[PDB]
Amino acid sequence: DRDDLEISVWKTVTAKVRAEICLKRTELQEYDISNAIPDIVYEGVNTKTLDKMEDASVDRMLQNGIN
Amino acid sequence: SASDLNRIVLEYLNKKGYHRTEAMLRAESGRTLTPQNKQSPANTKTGKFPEQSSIPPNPGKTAKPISNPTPENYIRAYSMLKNWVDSSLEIYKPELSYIMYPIFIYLFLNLVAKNPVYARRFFDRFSPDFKDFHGSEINRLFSVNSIDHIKENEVASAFQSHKYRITMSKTTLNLLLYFLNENESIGGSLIISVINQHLDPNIDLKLEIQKVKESRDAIKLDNLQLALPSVCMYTFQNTNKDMSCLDFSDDCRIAAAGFQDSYIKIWSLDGSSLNNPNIALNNNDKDEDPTCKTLVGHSGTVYSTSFSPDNKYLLSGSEDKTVRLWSMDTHTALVSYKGHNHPVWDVSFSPLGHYFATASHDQTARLWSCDHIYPLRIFAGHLNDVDCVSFHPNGCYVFTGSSDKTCRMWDVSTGDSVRLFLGHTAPVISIAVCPDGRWLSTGSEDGIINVWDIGTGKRLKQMRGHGKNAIYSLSYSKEGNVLISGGADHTVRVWDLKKATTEPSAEPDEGDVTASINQDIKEYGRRRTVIPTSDLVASFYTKKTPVFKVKFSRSNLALAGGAFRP
Amino acid sequence: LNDNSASVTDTGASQHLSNVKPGQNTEVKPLVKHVLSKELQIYFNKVISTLAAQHMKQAALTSLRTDSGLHQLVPYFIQFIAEQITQNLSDLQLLTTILEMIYSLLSNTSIFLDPYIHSLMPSILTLLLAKKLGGSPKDDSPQEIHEFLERTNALRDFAASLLDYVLKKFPQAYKSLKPRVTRTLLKTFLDINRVFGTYYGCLKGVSVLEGESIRFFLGNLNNWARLVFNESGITLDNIEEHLTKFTKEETQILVDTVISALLVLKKD
């Protein structure tokens, strides 16, 4: 069970902080409970539509000079 | 000048025919606060649904708020258990698939003895699901329609003698008992009586239900503590100051915004299709659907908008002197409602969706109905025009706030005002009444919220944390009292209603650094700054967008909404 | 109550780029023990001590499921769920009770649980894909082997049907825990050196998904069978007494469960 790269390096580089966390609970990271934001089902466009309008205008330049 | 008002009151009672003992006791009744109703939102154990009896409401047959203390048919009482066991493909699915049959059979055999047409509803409603599991026995139970029809079917007559046996585990029996104890008055007690009197559970039963109720009573939450809500903010971008007050539906799938150029804009908040295609799918993909529908029926500017609790209809009030109704599944107008001669400022549906109240510039509120073109009641008695309108959560009183620094509670049947609440110093702009119903809260354009109690009519306390500016919206916690105020100073604030009252609401036992130093900076000056009450706990600023709407959802998540201003 | 030759090309290129990609934090404060009243932690220890006496356990389960006002104790429950999972990973009755109180909080529609979705999914994904769950098989008996196997498979079949409950309770987090969980299952499934029960939990978690994702495991199943079952040039005749890692019973369980989920892709 040592032929997995991303799980072995996750065991190695986190081995000090998780011992302190599990010693703290009996009184990047994915199990700090308080500092987590949820996910929205749909958020609106705020930047992609600008470049979408710009390369759409370039596409209206790309159609051989018809306005 | 208040002792002279007390003397004028005493002489008014003496000339209007109140005995000295009677006037003293009515004064003592007027002074004491409205006590606590322990079934305040009607908890689902000892609380009942409203009757659907096709009559209009009536606030009579009712005692006073000052005094201390405070049939259910078989089809819904079975459909509760049916949906509860139908929502699970878990490890406990086929045991409920086992036990769902004889409770239905015994409810049918106990309902043919009382009401035959309700029994004919109840049999054919839940017929075709286990016909392949239980054979032609339900075909044998077609011919039972009376008490004497039970003597024809030998197995139906045997069902009174032969108690139906079922071998049930301890975890399934305790699951069923602790499900049917947590909501008695929906029909859980009606299921429990049939289980106790007609079934044979293999493992006394009355002692078992006594132990269930006692262990369920041994661990509850008596006095609740506060909780800070999570606010999801919907910011609208390309509205060049021409978006009036908006509203969200319930399930939060549709948003409705009224524009200054006589549109209603309808947004699918999930990015959905919002085209209602109805699988035929004829034609017209040539049009441009940006997941947003526009509604053009008004000729004036839309100043308010309200969603039905059914969430299938929209009610838009404009400055052309109509209120229009829109279908949210074909996106057209249905009914125009003409009863005003001035602009309409606040439409609001009922709790049960029966009939909507309206505010307008003509200093009168009007009660309507969705099937009548013209009004039903006229609420007159304010000095200036009515700004906000709201019902009591039973749909039995109306609350109107007006620009002459006051608000009123109106009887919905007799039309005349029952309460007049004085004490503000600015146009009341948003009003809201708690799900308990005993306390009224409203916000003015002075940035001051305040709460009265409807029994005494006087002020419990106020709230002084907003800027000297408008409080656009107001919302309540679903279970308990935490007020969420979204105003004009770009903040959404959180308020504890139960600090300075006789209900302290379970304060923590044991300090801060940021507390009492933030408004002790006072760089701008003592008289040129606000000083918050002890009731304000948090305040979320929105960075240059104002919040038109706060809508507290069912699960401690509020939603705010507004337009990005520059 | 909030929490009161240059080295800058690593604190700016991979400490605020591989942190701004999973959200952002400003130090929500869990523990000073001044944030809970007296009666609140009285109720908290009275519910954590009881998790003739099964009635009190079901009363605590239903009090978690239906009562409101426990929005302050909901981070203290996911702490004392995770420690009784990763610290007591040997007793199946306690793990069953902890999964019951996971399901009880996950049906309470009066508390907001979408913040805590990432600290509640690894408990479900570690009681489903554990390398060992019981740990004390009481060997030298085929009856005890079968009994321990059914006792540890009941927890896989329960935790797999708790993963499908949280893929439908939170549909707003779709495209944020559907590809994450199916990537966890595809990562844990595609190897040789795992124990049988982890493969069983992986295939049951595949079964509680739906649609083309199950079709997404159609191609890489042939080589998975050719590596885990050793059909090195076999002609399907002596299959009863041919194979090497497993025993006959658990191979029959694997061939049963690999088509218990494959029936979904041919019924439409």
Swiss-Prot record, chain A:
Protease PEP4 directly cleaves the C-terminus of SPT7(SAGA) to form SPT7(SLIK) within the SAGA complex in the nucleus. It is found in: Nucleus. Component of the transcription coactivator SAGA complex. SAGA acts as a general cofactor required for essentially all RNA polymerase II transcription. At the promoters, SAGA is required for transcription pre-initiation complex (PIC) recruitment. It influences RNA polymerase II transcriptional activity through different activities such as TBP interaction (via core/TAF module) and promoter selectivity, interaction with transcription activators (via Tra1/SPT module), and chromatin modification through histone acetylation (via HAT module) and deubiquitination (via DUB module). Component of the 1.8 MDa SAGA (Spt-Ada-Gcn5 acetyltransferase) complex, which is composed of 19 subunits TRA1, SPT7, TAF5, NGG1/ADA3, SGF73, SPT20/ADA5, SPT8, TAF12, TAF6, HFI1/ADA1, UBP8, GCN5, ADA2, SPT3, SGF29, TAF10, TAF9, SGF11 and SUS1. Present with 2360 molecules/cell in log phase SD medium. This is SAGA complex subunit SPT7. The lineage of its organism: Eukaryota, Fungi, Dikarya, Ascomycota, Saccharomycotina. The chain holds residues 728 to 888 of 1332 of the full protein.
Curated annotation (Swiss-Prot), chain B:
The keyword DNA-binding does not apply. Residues 31-55 have a biased composition (Polar residues). It comes from Saccharomyces cerevisiae (strain ATCC 204508 / S288c). Residues 27-70 are annotated as: Disordered. One of its GO terms (biological process) is positive regulation of transcription by RNA polymerase II. Belongs to the WD repeat TAF5 family. Pfam families: LisH, TFIID_NTD2, WD40. It is found in: Nucleus. The modification Phosphoserine is found at S555. WD repeats lie at residues 238-277, 297-336, 339-378, 381-420, 423-462, 466-505. Keywords: Coiled coil, Nucleus, Phosphoprotein, Repeat, Transcription, Transcription regulation, WD repeat. PANTHER family: CANNONBALL-RELATED, TRANSCRIPTION INITIATION FACTOR TFIID. InterPro entries: G-protein_beta_WD-40_rep, LisH, TFIID_NTD2, TFIID_NTD2_sf, WD40/YVTN_repeat-like_dom_sf, WD40_repeat_CS, WD40_repeat_dom_sf, WD40_rpt. GO terms for molecular function: chromatin binding; identical protein binding; molecular adaptor activity; ubiquitin binding. It comes from the Eukaryota. Residues 1-33 form the LisH domain. GO terms for cellular component: nucleus; SAGA complex; SLIK (SAGA-like) complex; transcription factor TFIID complex. Component of the 1.8 MDa SAGA (Spt-Ada-Gcn5 acetyltransferase) complex, which is composed of 19 subunits TRA1, SPT7, TAF5, NGG1/ADA3, SGF73, SPT20/ADA5, SPT8, TAF12, TAF6, HFI1/ADA1, UBP8, GCN5, ADA2, SPT3, SGF29, TAF10, TAF9, SGF11 and SUS1. The C-terminal WD40 motifs are required for its incorporation into TFIID and function in SAGA. This is SAGA complex/transcription factor TFIID complex subunit TAF5. Its main location: nucleus. Functions as a component of both the DNA-binding general transcription initiation factor complex TFIID and the transcription coactivator SAGA complex. Binding of TFIID to a promoter (with or without TATA element) is the initial step in pre-initiation complex (PIC) formation. Present with 14834 (+/-203) molecules/cell in log phase SD medium.
UniProtKB/Swiss-Prot annotation, chain C:
Its main location: nucleus. One of its GO terms (biological process) is chromatin organization. It comes from the Eukaryota. The keyword Cytoplasm applies. The keyword Transcription applies. It is found in: Nucleus; Cytoplasm. GO terms for molecular function: chromatin binding; identical protein binding; molecular adaptor activity; protein heterodimerization activity; RNA polymerase II general transcription initiation factor activity; RNA polymerase II-specific DNA-binding transcription factor binding; transcription coactivator activity. Keywords: Cytoplasm, Nucleus, Transcription, Transcription regulation. GO terms for cellular component: cytosol; nucleus; SAGA complex; SLIK (SAGA-like) complex; transcription factor TFIID complex. Functions as a component of both the DNA-binding general transcription initiation factor complex TFIID and the transcription coactivator SAGA complex. Binding of TFIID to a promoter (with or without TATA element) is the initial step in pre-initiation complex (PIC) formation. The histone-fold domain (HFD) is required for interaction with TAF9. Present with 6506 (+/-1290) molecules/cell in log phase SD medium. Belongs to the TAF6 family. Component of the 1.8 MDa SAGA (Spt-Ada-Gcn5 acetyltransferase) complex, which is composed of 19 subunits TRA1, SPT7, TAF5, NGG1/ADA3, SGF73, SPT20/ADA5, SPT8, TAF12, TAF6, HFI1/ADA1, UBP8, GCN5, ADA2, SPT3, SGF29, TAF10, TAF9, SGF11 and SUS1. This is SAGA complex/transcription factor TFIID complex subunit TAF6. It comes from Saccharomyces cerevisiae (strain ATCC 204508 / S288c) (Baker's yeast).
